[PDB]
Point group: C3
Chain length 598, copies 3
């Protein structure tokens, strides 16, 4: 039977006619033509005889998936389905350009992957480096062509097989898109591994419009060998992460894992949830990555995320090379709800909402960070966590503005004494920042705002308490080593009546010509003997810098009243005019708001 032979052969479908819904106005097609409108891994997952091979732990599907990608690429692109209901194992490295990146699969432009099933790494990869999907087409990224219009999506899973790193110097990634333009990962679960990154977008600023959306990243650090982990590394502009879920359960992740890094301009991290990580996001301009999009990381957004972390939520940085200086500016951090998870004090990296960090080599004098707006966020750390701050300011800062946040942690501004001595400019802490009381009574020997810096200039710190904490040493303290100029420092009187110290200037810095300061203090006064209007003067002479002061105490006397307001004198005394109904020298102790130029 000749016709039988033709129909049963691989060309059979090309001899069965078809017309859509019997529409005589439709194209006269062959069944093969219609089936050709889709493509799956099954169309390439065959032995050399063309007989299909079933996937499984005993089968390496790499070559077949590569063949599919290669073939679809040469036809101008399309979408390859990785079928649901099966697990497809990868058990060897790819070859060519991706070899230099320990690549398994090479992605190609215009070839999308619809992962509905599961992709799983075989034991071959135990203790070895790997990059599962690689978009570079040359071992030297600088010589690589671009990856364009490559989208990975579906309800499927990329499982890294649980293998630990073999050595800390190794690198592992899920999707390394390369010099990627209009590439994305959507809907995929990345799980069960010990990797450096799950997804990297771009290369040294080369790339654009790359996005990670609605993905899950689960348990991607599992050993002490893993040197560092950032789940999504965004290294091209006009790119970002949205509506993802990141979770770690390993102890090690709490010390080394960060959910996202934003390294280029016009990048974002929004609407995501993080649990079990050390850090939320690094927002940094590394000068070594400035080739593709310039040396300025601007228009950076971290918004509307939810996190439980053990270290720092947002870490800001910038650094230089011999010929390039990195700059970070125009950043917004807003609408995030973040808490330091339960842990012993000092058992993980210092808890912080914002960290101004030193560069990779520890340099704290190379940063150019400014025009950062931190607003409308909530931060919480349990009362026992001494190492928790709204901002750990450890390197030079050229500007950061805090407005309308709620910070409930040990410190508001902090830098460790005897460590770095940052130069701080344009730090603005608005009075609308609400300071929570979880750490009330835990602050013996501590300063709420601990200004351990070389210098502070053009800065504003408006301290507003909302409950008492009589355990703290001071609300704000400037060591003698910290220069302060052209700045405004105020401590609102509410909840401070019983505090011994409110603002402390160990170098008498509040006397600066362009320092604007106000804070409460207790002052002893005596008067002359005169009946009628009579001056009261301070006993002490430590007020030569005071422009005015006013009473914060009642006067429990009938026969006299001290002045409501005071100026100073050349010798450093305060002086005001009170009233003696009857004559006599008076002596009183009063709580005063001391003011300088405000």
């Amino acid at each position: 039977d000749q016709f039988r032979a033709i129909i049963e052969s691989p060309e059979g479908a090309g001899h069965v006619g078809y017309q859509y819904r019997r529409n005589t106005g439709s194209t006269m097609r062959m069944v093969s033509d219609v089936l050709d409108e889709r493509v799956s891994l099954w169309d390439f997952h065959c032995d050399p005889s063309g007989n299909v091979i079933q996937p499984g732990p005993n089968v390496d599907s790499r070559q077949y998936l590569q063949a599919a990608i290669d073939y679809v690429s040469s036809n101008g692109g399309g979408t390859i389905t990785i079928p649901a209901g099966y697990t497809w194992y990868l058990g060897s490295y790819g070859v060519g350009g991706i070899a230099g990146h320990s690549g398994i699969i090479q992605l190609r432009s215009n070839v999308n992957l619809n992962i509905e099933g599961r992709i799983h790494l075989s034991p071959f990869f135990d203790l070895k480096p790997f990059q599962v999907f690689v978009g570079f087409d040359n071992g030297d990224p600088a010589s690589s062509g671009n990856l364009e219009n490559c989208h990975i999506y579906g309800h499927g899973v990329v499982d890294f097989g649980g293998y630990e790193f073999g050595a800390s110097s190794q690198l592992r990634n899920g999707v390394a898109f390369g010099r990627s333009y209009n590439c994305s990962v959507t809907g995929i679960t990345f799980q069960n591994g010990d990797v450096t990154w799950a997804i990297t977008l771009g290369w040294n600023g080369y790339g654009s419009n790359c996005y990670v959306r609605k993905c899950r990243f689960i348990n991607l650090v599992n050993s002490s060998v893993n040197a560092d982990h950032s789940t999504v590394y965004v290294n091209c502009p006009y790119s970002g992460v949205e509506s993802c879920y990141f979770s770690m359960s390993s102890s090690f992740a709490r010390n080394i894992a960060c959910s996202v890094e934003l390294h280029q301009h016009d990048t974002f991290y929004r609407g995501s949830t993080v649990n079990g990580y050390c850090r939320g996001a690094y927002v940094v301009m590394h000068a070594a990555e400035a080739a593709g999009a310039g040396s300025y990381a601007y228009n950076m957004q971290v918004e509307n995320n939810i996190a439980v972390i053990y270290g720092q939520f947002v870490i800001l940085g910038s650094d230089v090379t011999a010929t390039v200086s990195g700059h970070l500016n125009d950043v917004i951090v807003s609408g995030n709800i973040v808490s330091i998870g339960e842990r012993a004090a000092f058992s993980a990296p210092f808890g912080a909402f914002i960290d101004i960090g030193p560069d990779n080599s520890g340099a704290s004098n190379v940063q150019d960070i400014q025009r950062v707006l931190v607003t409308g966020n909530s931060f919480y750390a349990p009362a026992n966590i001494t190492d928790s701050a709204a901002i750990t300011l450890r390197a030079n800062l050229n500007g950061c503005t805090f407005i309308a946040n709620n910070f409930d942690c040990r410190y508001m501004v902090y830098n460790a004494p005897g460590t770095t001595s940052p130069v701080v400019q344009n730090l603005v802490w608005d009075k609308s920042n609400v300071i929570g009381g979880t750490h009330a009574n835990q602050r013996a020997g501590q300063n709420l705002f601990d200004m351990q810096f070389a210098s502070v200039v053009n800065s504003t710190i408006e301290v507003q308490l909302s409950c008492e904490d009589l355990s703290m040493f001071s609300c704000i303290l400037f060591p003698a080593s910290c220069q302060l100029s052209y700045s405004k420092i105020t401590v609102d009187s509410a909840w401070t009546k019983s505090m011994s110290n409110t603002a402390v200037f160990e170098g008498n810095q509040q006397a600066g010509a362009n320092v604007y300061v106000s804070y409460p203090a207790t002052v002893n006064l005596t008067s002359y003997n005169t009946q009628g209007a009579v001056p009261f003067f301070s006993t002490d002479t430590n007020y030569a810098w005071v422009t005015s002061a006013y009473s914060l105490s009642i006067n429990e006397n009938l026969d006299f009243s001290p002045p409501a307001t005071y100026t100073n004198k050349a010798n450093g005394q305060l002086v005001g005019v009170g009233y003696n109904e009857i004559g006599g020298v008076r002596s009183v102790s009063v709580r005063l708001m001391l003011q300088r130029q405000v």
Copy 2:
């Protein structure tokens, strides 16, 4: 013709060969194999003879859809398409585990539903309870297995057929995912019903990563019989609702319908639009639902939503059982634009942006709600709506912070007199909250901040007006029954010059040792006869609590000037030193800012 018989039989496609795009490197497949890569309801919507049955109002498609789900489940999962261009009717209950939930269809793990057509409930369900899709596999949820990786998506519709409830005690749901992990509904329109919920995620904290995105919910309450409605009920952590649309047209919905409830930690409600509902979202930790994820609802986000409602936007709550206490903390409500739709005063539940509500049995002394941040929202209620407040504070509150909102409604803080007497702690109303003027001139006999509580502690109320309203009785009023301690209460002077009362303390609570207060008042003063510096004293003796006061009035005199500032005396008089150019007893009425410890 033997070959003809084989080809025309159901095994025919298994005898037609195919090779993708004639690629000799591709798998030699049978047409049947390629068609097997997809599956639709048509593959199971047949009579016992295997002859296809057309769907319609006269056909019950339930058994066929169940057969499809069951079959795909046993093959490890996949996606079943519910074809476009047809309406598929359901007209009977399912059986087994879902029977205890009035279930129609039982969902199974890894089996997704791509609903492109319409699913419609037949009259069989009129006046009866139903749950359209159920993920539980046992009548007892505590004994049920988990539903994993189940996604419902598409451009289709679930139509509840418009049937009213038969009785208020009945329950109705669209998708009850059960103990659901990685389940979602995306893109679907749920419409035309009288239901309790459209979608429930999780069960008593069991579940994770469940999401409702880009769905529409239209007219899901239509009768007086419906007891309660919440469109999406989120009862598992790490789950949420994003970019949905909720609309009701029925009068009944304005009294009973809420768009979302968030019941577990790390849940969110963002970027959605609501119209015609009573309420926006309940954000509550019910102790009875604490089994799967603990008794703390933390990291709760309500952000960037748009709403027109008739009752309350966000309702906060927590309650206890005999052995479990619920806690709600670490909540952020921000970026929402909300208005109370046009309605007569008192014709719907009391209008509010935030409501601190009593539990289901009316208890107002069981709540543990704190660390709530409400910032950057806009709220509006038409001028006639007496029952409108920024916050209705009706049950115990342990903390809530308001910063940088615009509230344009009748009351800022309100609790009805003669009802509950909440214990309020850590209520912070920052001065940056802008109080709109829509209700100006409508406040006869009313207090803008009506502090009808048992006690207020560690709280801040900084009242800042932005226009005049001389109709109000006071800006803030504390009844004698309200204890006040360790708190800051201030009324800015702007727009208050002509107000008879600014802050009113009916129990003289402003005299508290740790109360920090300032507000304007008019005070009559007289002076002694002395030429030169001369004291002025208040006629009245109601100022024993005042630490200082200063003039808010000009002095229209040449021959004397009253003091700019004043202290007090033991008898409760104010006293200051003014100046008589010429002697004579003086008498003046002055507007003063009265201050205590500020």
Copy 3:
């Protein structure tokens, strides 16, 4: 061979049997039936003989795509795939109802387009108007039926072919959905054109639930002929744009292009990135578009966007017709990070974060704009850009509230002198707005807040500097032509000690009965000769409006002290009681905070 003939004919697939995965419980189907579950352009892209035609620059695919849409529509809807790996060219106009709109393709209800390949306009369209996809079904939109449930999505591209406009009066659009309900565009790249709009949603308020998500719009303006461009025009309620990318490279776009317009209630623009445009979004209620959804545009959201623009970020407007008055209210602008790109001063439309604009004919006295909340945004303009303002207030304003923003540009509030004279009501500029220092030293002859208005009422301007700028003429200036009443104007003293002018009232408006003002000034005082308590009086008589004043200077004297606080006298002098330790007339120059009713 009869059977061969049947199988090879277009009816062949209808004679090959199939049963899903050989399941005897599945439907006995024909291969044709299964293939009929999907449909693509290939099923209609054939010559009259039914022989397929390959697409290309030489082939007009319009008629074939229209045939596909028409056919699928008549079957109750479905999704037509536009295949990947091919470019489909359109080279002629459609006919019928869409002819009046220069339409190419007519969309139909329930017919979705999955664009995976590329759609490209042929040279036929060079210099001509066109609307690529049109949802109207009648040349007269008022007589058109509705377009419902039409979704365009995929990884594909709509390329406008780079053709310039032939004339400025022409119009061009990508997708004009018409009276559109539940329509959307998702994932598509629109590129390479000179168009008026890329996408229009709704028609004069008719429509609902239309969304543009995850789309890219690249280089859609390229000539001087193009009169105006707005990429997405939202003209139906309950609709919006989310997570899109907009980029222009042409010089012309910097002068005429806007990314989005929001024209109806309950609309939004969120999470998008814009580069190279003149403007971000117009948020306007045009009375001429009030038919479908009323004359009020309320619940308008512009949130969490990132932009580099050359003109104005958000432009607010409303206008009237003979019988309809437009109103704009209940708007929120928050979480946006925006910068004016590098450009010469005055080389593009005046840089602004918010612009209150005149109507299309230049009218500035027809607007009804109120209840606008601008919070938590960051705005930056390089130092050379004189024409940069937080708000350019050029038309009547009934309310706008600014809280917790960071504005780093030349002006905070600005209107050009000698142009319009707006009536301003309910403008609130909270003290929590942080004023950046990029323009410090560039403000010679300029007023930071330049209040060039006819009148200001019920407004608040709380100026808070965060660094010095001694170049500016004043912090705030009211010309004599600007009435001011029932308003609060304050200038915080920090960074102002060396300023010659702080607040300037050229018409002495600070003396108003209901004006609440405070600002620093230098005042010369002399005293009487009296030993002991002694009055000091100002030499000048310009303080008849001052209610109190206090010292902002130290007293570098031992023998006397001036008063800490002052009142006034009828003749306009300040007066206070100081102290002469030793007698003698004293003369001092002091910096004072002058206060009126605050």
